[PDB]
Design an enzyme around this catalytic site. Structure first.
Site, PDB file in Angstrom:
ATOM      1  CD  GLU A   1     -67.314 -15.929 -17.249  1.00  0.00           C
ATOM      2  OE1 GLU A   1     -68.268 -15.564 -17.481  1.00  0.00           O
ATOM      3  OE2 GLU A   1     -66.771 -15.248 -16.059  1.00  0.00           O
TER       4      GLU A   1
ATOM      5  CG  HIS B   1     -64.957 -20.551  -6.010  1.00  0.00           C
ATOM      6  ND1 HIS B   1     -65.692 -19.808  -6.485  1.00  0.00           N
ATOM      7  CD2 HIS B   1     -64.632 -20.205  -4.571  1.00  0.00           C
ATOM      8  CE1 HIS B   1     -65.244 -18.237  -5.661  1.00  0.00           C
ATOM      9  NE2 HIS B   1     -65.020 -18.947  -4.527  1.00  0.00           N
TER      10      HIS B   1
ATOM     11  CG  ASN C   1     -67.109 -19.771 -10.403  1.00  0.00           C
ATOM     12  OD1 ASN C   1     -66.773 -20.534  -9.571  1.00  0.00           O
ATOM     13  ND2 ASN C   1     -67.903 -19.477 -11.259  1.00  0.00           N
TER      14      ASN C   1
END
Lengths: 182, 182, 182, 182, 182, 182
Positions: free
Chosen positions: F102, F72, F67
């Protein structure tokens, strides 16, 4: 009273919701106009920048003409025949919907203007060789208006240009695949 | 495809249920025709043998004229006028409902033909006396047609009979009350 | 009091709508009887004149015995066995549903009496061959009674006819397929 | 599958909700047992410390006896007569509900054991002089079991002691108002 | 799909609707702020030209200090008392909603400046005279800010007027009623 | 009333239900964590003695760092890729849900320790080989913690096992699959 009115306004609004769950046209088993509207918005916002989608307006050439000679029950079996033929031509994840009494609309995830161009020919030609069962129809052709779906596009505008391409394809002799901005 | 049509049919069945919850007419604050129909049906069934309900049809006189001279907004006031008036006359537990553009319908549980005729006159004279705010009226009257709901009646038929009496009361020169089978 | 009974009646109408959404039988993963009834009705109506649907009633043989020797849990396995098997045989778009404790029902859109008889044998032999996990079976068979749904049929009657054929197939010594009007 | 089961478990749960909106017994137009259960919990927790509520179990004496001699339709008109007579005896905001086929239950906001005591006599006596219309009944009496509702009370326990008082009132000759812990 | 996106937004649509059915403040039993907002758009619309409604914002005086001196529950009890009291004072068909933690709001249908002022005074005094029970509380009062809701008015602007007027009454010494455009 | 309390709790009951219909993670198109929890109680129950299910917890490797380095949206795109990939690898009827930001979770129905391990490896490698588009990303991998879901097992305990196993695989160097009781 005002209380009753607010209350019944609530219920009508629930009815509206229920009406959005009715998302598909039974005749052709495709999605209806309103659910397409709502789906395409959702799709446009998901797009990464510098990415595109395919968008096409599909109109059946001289459909109104088929209704007179062959009666209405025939013309509907033509429409079901397009749905069938389209379902077969199209890949999984592609969006087809019934856009009007005579028209349909398409969206292809992450599709190039050549991919775009390709699919519409495949569809169009497949409707030429199409054989609607239980109906003896002389001719079968559709015309297409294409364009693309860029990021930050406006839908009402995006639909105007594919229609332009389509109307130009309708004057181009029908059985025509025409594009707008590729 | 059949599961879809079945599913969406349920959907539409739910829309109709919700409809039956929208049970009042917002302009008057009275129950609407459909809800009255559903109530009366269960009042007919719950009727002990050899017992009765009163049942009148109320129609406002020259109402259409009021809309023409004074505009559709005054027409509406007159109906809120009648609705207000009627609620002053009726006992708690009477059923009163809007039945048409200018028609209302009344049901009095366990009410003699005498009782009914007494109720309707009191209602009739009360209307005549009333003045709606912000609208100058030539004058106000209503007509009524009355009858009795018997056990083992047909509700459509019962209703047909009050409409016969209402027809005669109109014919008699209005602002009056006629009856059928009492 | 009538408004209450009306209101709560709507309530119960909504409960029944929700019921019609509970459209599948959890043990088998097939559509339940009620949902089949609603689907078949709309397949009967959507029938063009002089066209037909296939319609068979499937019953598993000596099923009750299995429950007695092997316990109600094995009975259940056998039914999940049949459900699994059948889905391997049928074309996409067939309608198969649970119809009773041990009865199933099939509907094949636009299927000749030949087509139907072909489908049922293949199903019948497939069942015979199968072995359910974790349950030792003396052997497995099913019987079927078949017929055709015609336009302007009665669905109850159509059904009565397959049950007649299923009765004879049981009588014939089971593990077979009988028909009525083909 | 597991997905379908979770899904249908959701729908059944909605049905349960709908069933909680059906909060009243149509026959007597009082609240039903389950809605009382739910209401009383809500009421008990609202109570300030050192505060009380009134709670009584009401049983109609020899109700089953009335059914035999006068048939069932009569015994129901007795029950409706109690509801009527109770509605008339009771103040606004007081909670009456139908607790069983033969029994009712009461709750009185912020009520003293004397207030308690008072209301039950008024009710009981009013059922003595009660005149159920269209039914010629020889005798009319009810017995009462009372107690109170303190803060941090347990409902199943609170209902056990008023019943005790009631059963003791049933052996005390019927037409008896008996209490528990005042 | 994006279809999936659409379908869950619909369900989300529904929860919001269901939320609008929770229309009343559970502590007081009055309409909550949201339900009032919706009731009041609807009155504002149903307003004839050159006609108007009464609007007031009612704030209880030194409420915060009450909580500190007598405890959160005692404050809560004071709120109840205000509802009880106001219910007594209000003509049937007046709209009273809880607007905030210690503030209320009152709509008066078709009410005069003079009529509004009379109501708030009767209300201001009545609450002054009140005695919640539990709870002994040394003294109670409220202050009131008023205005008129005309046609072509902004309801939020109308509320600004009332708010400001409520501020002058707090500033002016409390236990009073200020106003703005009467 | 307290009745009012009860009726709004019911509506609140309903919203919660409606919430259970929102069953899928909109970004990936997988089932969300709550829907999985409910699907998995139901499998655990439907489990025959001496039989079991496969359970795995899948965490993508160095996601946070992705990220930071690519933004993002790029992270979000990686998540999509994992869903796409897994969809390819999974036998039909495998349950894959998003479990966290995740992390995923997979149930394998009636699967062997050996069968589970083979699936996670095929999955671990397949994801290694993948290329999301947009998005050029230097390298991808995930780590997998596995266990078996037996009958009489606690599903939260089962998940603890998987979690721990997932920790050893992160600790052991990532791009691997550890396990607990196989």
């Amino acid at each position: 009273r005002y209380a009753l009115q607010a209350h019944q306004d609530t219920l009508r609004g629930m009815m509206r919701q229920l009406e959005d769950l009715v998302a598909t046209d039974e005749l052709t088993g495709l999605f209806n106009r309103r659910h397409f509207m709502r789906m395409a918005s959702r799709a446009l916002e998901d797009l990464l920048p510098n990415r595109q989608h395919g968008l096409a307006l599909i109109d059946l050439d001289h459909f109104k003409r088929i209704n007179d000679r062959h009666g209405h029950a025939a013309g509907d079996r033509v429409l079901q025949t397009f749905a069938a033929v389209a379902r077969s031509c199209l890949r999984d994840g592609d969006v087809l919907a019934r856009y009007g009494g005579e028209e349909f609309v398409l969206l292809l995830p992450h599709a190039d203007a050549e991919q775009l161009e390709s699919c519409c020919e495949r569809l169009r030609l497949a409707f030429q060789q199409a054989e609607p069962v239980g109906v003896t129809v002389d001719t079968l052709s559709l015309s297409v208006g294409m364009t693309l779906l860029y990021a930050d596009d406006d839908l009402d505008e995006a639909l105007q240009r594919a229609d332009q391409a389509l109307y130009r394809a309708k004057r181009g002799g029908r059985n025509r695949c025409d594009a707008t901005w590729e």
